[PDB]
From a paper:
In this study, we report that one of them, named LrsL, is a metallo-β-lactamase superfamily QQ enzyme with outstanding catalytic features. The QQ enzymes hydrolyzing the lactone ring of AHLs are called lactonases, whereas those cleaving the amide bond are amidases or acylases. LrsL has an unusually hydrophobic substrate binding pocket that can accommodate a broad range of acyl-homoserine lactones (AHLs) with exceptionally high affinity. In vitro, LrsL achieves the highest catalytic efficiency reported thus far for any QQ enzyme with a Kcat/KM of 3 × 107.
To gain experimental insights into the mechanism of catalysis and self-assembly, we determined the three-dimensional structure of LrsL, showing residues 49–331 at a resolution of 1.9 Å. The crystals contain a symmetric LrsL dimer in the asymmetric unit, burying a total protein surface of 1,135 Å2 in the interface. Size exclusion chromatography–multiangle light scattering analysis confirmed that LrsL was eluted as a single peak with a molecular mass of 61.2 kDa corresponding to an LrsL dimer. The LrsL dimeric arrangement resembles closely the one of AidC, with an r.m.s.d of 0.952 Å. However, AidC has an extension of the loop between helices α5 and α6, which is absent in LrsL and most other lactonases. The crystal structure of LrsL exhibits a functional catalytic site where the conserved H151XH153XD155H156 ~ H236 ~ D257 ~ H304 (superscript show the position of amino acid in full-length protein) motif residues and one water molecule are coordinating two zinc ions as the metal cofactor, akin to AidC and other previously investigated lactonases. We crystallized LrsL without AHL but noticed an unoccupied electron density above the zinc molecules. Secondly, LrsL shows a unique presence of three phenylalanines (F197, F200, and F275) in a position where they can coordinate the AHL tail carbons C1–C5 particularly well, suggesting a strong interaction with the substrate. Minor differences were found in the side chain orientations of the phenylalanines F197, F200, and F275, and in the orientation of the helix carrying these residues. These regions have an elevated B-factor in the crystal structure, and hence the differences with the AlphaFold2 model may reflect this flexibility which could be related to catalysis/substrate binding.
Residue numbers in the entry:
A (entry chain B), B (entry chain A): 49 to 336
Write the structure that this text describes.
Amino acid sequence: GALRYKVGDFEVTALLDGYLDVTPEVVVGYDEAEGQRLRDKSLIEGNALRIPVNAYLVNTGDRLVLVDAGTSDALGPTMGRLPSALEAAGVSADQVDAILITHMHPDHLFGVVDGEGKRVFANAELILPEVDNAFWYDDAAMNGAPEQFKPFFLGARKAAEAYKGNQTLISGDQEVLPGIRSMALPGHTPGHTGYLFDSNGETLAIAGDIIHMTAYQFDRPDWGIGFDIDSPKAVETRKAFLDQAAGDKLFFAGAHIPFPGMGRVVKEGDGYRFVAANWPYAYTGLEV
Amino acid sequence: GALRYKVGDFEVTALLDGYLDVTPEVVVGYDEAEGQRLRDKSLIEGNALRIPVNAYLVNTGDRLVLVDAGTSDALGPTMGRLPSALEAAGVSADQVDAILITHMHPDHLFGVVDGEGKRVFANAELILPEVDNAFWYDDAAMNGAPEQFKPFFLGARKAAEAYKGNQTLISGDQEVLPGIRSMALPGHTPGHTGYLFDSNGETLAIAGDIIHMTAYQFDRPDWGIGFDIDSPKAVETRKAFLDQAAGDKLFFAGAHIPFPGMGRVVKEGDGYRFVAANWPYAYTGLEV
Ligand SMILES: [Zn+2]
Ligand SMILES: [Zn+2]
Ligand SMILES: [Zn+2]
Ligand SMILES: [Zn+2]
């Protein structure tokens, strides 16, 4: 679960932290006739979709930066593969210089701490969108939260705090590191943020949880998922993101797009068709 | 360039030998207005398509069988990756017991011998389709071939002769090993052959060069490629194959389908749409 691409002078390695299965009862706006038509289009039997959890290592030439860090053990044994995906890519955890968090959900942030609350990445700066940090640290929010979801707030704080004195809070429109700009993508969480990478005239947008179920939400970008804090907002941000991406032919990556999670969209009627990136033939089998 | 799937009790590993680039002049039946439409559909700029060269390792339980063997060094440094893909899959060349050849073209057969013309797979039986063997050994066919193509005949013969005494010729509808049957797929070469894997009510058809350019030939299965020895017969075989594959939702693999080259088709009009296999998340990620 490690695949390496070139973006100008940057190397981007897709990393598979694992997978989870979701059924229609988490889908906002779901209808069964339409759900079945969409599953039949992808030759999917039954109503479970298997969704990857992806993170991306970017070697900018002078820093090694992770976008998201998977789950650790928080959601069971089907996740937390990120540390061994890193080994596959020839990288140890102690070489990571910075971790850019799209949002502070379990499957993006919890992989930054181990079982003891020890840092997985000893030498990394933890970079958090400050709008998301504020939410997860708000008690009004945490106490108004369905009891089964309170562990998310608590777990998010514990993960962030293992990086006390090595955190940078960022806004949704700022240069973060050379050739990395944040991009506000609010809705899924309040401070959900994508990261735009640019090197030598080439671009990759790492767009976090802009989409969860690619079997449904390219065709029906109006469908949400119950884990969206603000589902109508998330819908507006996805439609805006995909409209832009389609018109610019922007290469993007998504945490829950079938691994490696990278490609482009064509606009089609009132939805989109994803065109997956080709396998990196030359990079792996020539260039280096 | 090694990905592992399960078909019943068989483990099937896709192996990437490398890639090559093709432009419209090799396409039989090509039309520029349609070519550009199909390239726009896949967001391809320019008119070059990069196609993989795939081979497949099948562990049957007690035996390691390759379907095809890549190119070696015979078409330049963009191919010949197979020995290193095998290494990445934790297998060395001396462990391979049998090589089932779909057809004796360079990108399938010549990977069985190194630059000095000695066996790459010291312990393997070379299994050749009898009908294709007959064609490549035909002096009349070799002598009536364009000058640039005569070395394909001579190189086929040398690669086969490296395995003299450890060769088995097979017919186009026979059992090769338990759960593995040959199936004639004539046209691309006279004895071009696919292999059908059947284990515990799961099937995989490894269909060789049934298709070359997936950006065109699923939409336009009536288009051929100049390397088809009889392009009309190749078209007929391809249409019959894809027609059956679509009606039974057969999982199949192709040597030139974007790596890992495995998936299914749905019929749309008198063309087809390819649905690529999911990444093998569970098999390679939930381990004992
Ligand atoms: Zn999320
Ligand atoms: Zn997520
Ligand atoms: Zn061929
Ligand atoms: Zn071929």
